[PDB]
Every structure is written in C-alpha cells, then in structure tokens.
Design a protein around this ligand. Structure first.
Ligand SMILES: O=C(O)CC[C@H]1COc2c(ccc(CNCc3ccccc3C(=O)NCc3ccccc3)c2C(=O)O)O1
Ligand SMILES: O=C(O)CC[C@H]1COc2c(ccc(CNCc3ccccc3C(=O)NCc3ccccc3)c2C(=O)O)O1
Ligand SMILES: [Cl-]
Ligand SMILES: [Cl-]
Ligand SMILES: [Cl-]
Lengths: 149, 149
C-alpha cells in the first residue's frame, strides 16, 4: 500500500494533464504535456520515482501499459508496472471526482497565471494541502514513515 | 528544520541545473533549465512547495533573492524567502560536494539518455536512494513525519 501509485490522464485547453495519485493518501503530482506519449509518460515516472518510493504503478491506459519506453522507465526506476483495470469499481469514481476537483481548482486560479502549467502546479499545491482533518501531504508522509519503521 | 530548503544552481553542457536541497536530510529535487531566470526559479519553487511542506527557502544568489517573481512565488506558496549567506562555512562545502557528486552520477548515466534532463532525473533518483544506513529519501519522510507527530 505505501508504494502504490495510479496514473491518470485528463484534458484541458487542448492540452494533456498527466497525474500520478498515491492511492492510500490521495496525494498527487502532475504535469502539463502537449500529448500523452510513452516518452512523456516514461520521463514523468522517472521523476516521480526519484522523489517518492514508487513500488507499483497502475498505468492509466493500455498504450502506456504496452509502451516499451514506459516499460524501460519502470525497469530503470525499479517500478512494478501494472494495468489499471478497476476491479474495485469505486476506483473509477474516485479518479473521475479527482479530475473534476482538479479542473475546478484550475478554474479558481486560472487568472493568476498566463500559462496552464502554472495553474496546474497551483492546483497540485491546493489539492495536497487541503484538509479533509489531515491533508494528503500529511497522509503520504505518515504512511511512508510508518512503513519505514 | 523540517521545512528548511536551500536552492543551488550548477552548470553542465552549457545548461543550468537548478537544485533544491532539504537541508536536514540531503534529499533533493532538480530540473534542467536553459538559464536561471526569476521566472524559472519561481515556477520551480511553486512545484516544490506543492510536493513538500516548504516553510523556508534559502535562495541560491542575490538575483533570485531580489526577484519580484520569486518573491511572488514565495508569497503564493507560503514560503519564507531568505538569503543564502553561509554563516556556517560548512554550508559551502556541503553544496559544493553535492554538486560534484551529482555531476559524477550524471557522467555515470550520461550514455543511458540522449537528453541531459533525463540524466539529471536519474541522478536525482540515485542520490535520493543512496544509503549512507538510511537514504536521504527515508530521512526526509522520517523528519517530516516526526514533525507532524
Ligand atoms: O520530451 C518528452 O517526451 C519527455 C522528455 C524526454 C527526455 O528524454 C528522454 C525521455 C524519456 C526517455 C529517454 C530515454 N530514451 C531512450 C534511450 C536513449 C539513449 C540511450 C538509452 C535510452 C534508453 O532506452 N534508456 C533507458 C531508459 C528509458 C526510459 C527511462 C529511463 C531509462 C529520454 C532520453 O533519451 O533522454 O523523456
Ligand atoms: O518558462 C519559465 O520560466 C518557467 C515556466 C513559467 C510558466 O508560467 C509562469 C511561470 C512563473 C510565474 C508565472 C506567473 N506569472 C505572473 C502572472 C501572470 C498573470 C497573472 C498573474 C501573475 C502573477 O504574478 N501570479 C502570481 C504568482 C507569481 C509567481 C508564482 C506564482 C504565482 C507564470 C505564468 O504566468 O503562468 O513559470
Ligand atoms: Cl494525447
Ligand atoms: Cl548556487
Ligand atoms: Cl544562467
């Protein structure tokens, strides 16, 4: 559980927002990319795994699951690459609701930045700091620290 | 101490590597940029603060300390912007040694990537996972978790 992440890709302003969600905490990292290629996904995973102890990644779609470049990144970073089939149907709803929430926040900050990438990073900040009462940022650290201990 | 970060800028292949160091743990995040502008530094800090609980940032130089855009990012993200004067002279040596280490690792992986940005993210991964015996990644999580209580 401490090392499980889920990839998620959503669209806004004719651009792609690639998101990684730490499943147990709801903590996210995200980036704006022109399009969702294996190369972009691979680079994103390399960054993620250098920053958090990523054991397992549930890929967002079959193309990224298939991608040799994504597989190569997972090999390099010591990540178990898995599919993203929602065996638990609640997974769908959670990701869908998160995408809605992220887009809402982006709208709330959109006039504070010229570029979408900036608005997305503001949304990441707000999402991770939001108290629901602990924040997702507090939860991920506590979960991982407990695992280390 | 749990929320204290230091900025660091080093050069390689005619490009700029911007690094943030969590002082207490030695954990880093880094990016390659064409040049070190206030705008680039501001965006980097916005990303960092969305991902870790950044209380204080010691800026890497006077230009970034002065930069209204950097000040605006620190305001936005709730970061205390400070100077980077090494009142403790050991600070210099530590940053210098880290830059040497990072460049060494980049050299060790350089042929595994076409682009410097990729090599830098590999270096971030290796640096943060390296056992010195805990890793910097383990230390940062433990330090922050203990602070949260
Ligand atoms: O622009 C975007 O899409 C996002 C940015 C780009 C930045 O460059 C890259 C990138 C994504 C991937 C690579 C690796 N390329 C294959 C390669 C070229 C030359 C030598 C070896 C290899 C190799 O297979 N190594 C094993 C490996 C694969 C994937 C990840 C880590 C390690 C680059 C790069 O070559 O630098 O994302
Ligand atoms: O290319 C690079 O250098 C790195 C990428 C760029 C991507 O875009 C940006 C960036 C860095 C900064 C900004 C904000 N610009 C001022 C601005 C423009 C329009 C409206 C408001 C503001 C404003 O002052 N907001 C308060 C604020 C300032 C800095 C940081 C966060 C919040 C952008 C952007 O406008 O989107 O880094
Ligand atoms: Cl796409
Ligand atoms: Cl510096
Ligand atoms: Cl420069």
């Amino acid at each position: 559980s401490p090392g499980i992440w889920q990839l998620d890709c959503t669209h806004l302003e004719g651009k792609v927002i690639l998101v990684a969600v730490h499943v147990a905490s709801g903590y996210i990292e995200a980036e704006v990319i022109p399009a969702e290629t294996g190369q972009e996904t691979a680079y994103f995973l390399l960054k993620l795994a250098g920053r958090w102890p990523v054991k397992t990644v549930h890929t967002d779609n079959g193309s990224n699951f298939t991608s040799t470049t994504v597989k190569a990144a997972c090999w390099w970073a010591g990540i178990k690459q898995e599919d993203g089939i929602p065996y638990n149907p609640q997974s769908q709803g959670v990701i869908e609701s998160m995408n809605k929430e992220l887009k809402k926040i982006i709208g709330q900050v959109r006039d504070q930045a010229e570029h979408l990438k900036t608005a997305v990073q503001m949304a990441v900040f707000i999402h991770n700091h939001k108290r629901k009462g602990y924040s997702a940022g507090e939860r991920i650290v506590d979960i991982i620290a407990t695992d280390i201990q």
